[PDB]
Amino acid sequence: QLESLINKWSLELEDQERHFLQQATQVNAWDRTLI
């Protein structure tokens, strides 16, 4: 039971971790462009 939510929230972390880094690089670019 719990481990079938863990191994799911590993894959849903390993999803969001990439979206966060790609959105962070996009934010740093648009901060440089607005300066």
Partner 1 sequence: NLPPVICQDVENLQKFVKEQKQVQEEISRMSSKAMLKVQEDIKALKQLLSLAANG
Partner 2 sequence: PTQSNQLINTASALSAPTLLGDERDAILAKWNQLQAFWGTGKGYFNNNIPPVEFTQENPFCRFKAVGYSCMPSNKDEDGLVVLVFNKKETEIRSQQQQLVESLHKVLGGNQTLTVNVEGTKTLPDDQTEVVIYVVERSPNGTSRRVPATTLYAHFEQANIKTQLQQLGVTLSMTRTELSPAQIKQLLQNPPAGVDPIIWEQAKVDNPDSEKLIPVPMVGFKELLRRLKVQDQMTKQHQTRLDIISEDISELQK
Residues of this chain that interact with partner 1 (CB under 8 A) are 2, 5, 9, 12, 16, 19-20, 23, 30, 33-34
The CB-of-4 to partner 2 minimum distance in angstroms stands at 11
Q: Which contacts (CB < 8 Å, 24+ apart) does range 3-7 have?
A: none
Task: Give residue 11's Cα distance to chain centre.
Answer: 12
Question: Is 21 a residue that touches partner 2 (CB under 8 A)?
Answer: yes
* Shortest distance, position 1 Cβ to partner 2, whole Å: 10
CA atoms within 13 A on the CB side of 19: 6
Binding partner at 4 among partner 2, partner 1, none, C-beta below 5 to 8 Å by kind: none
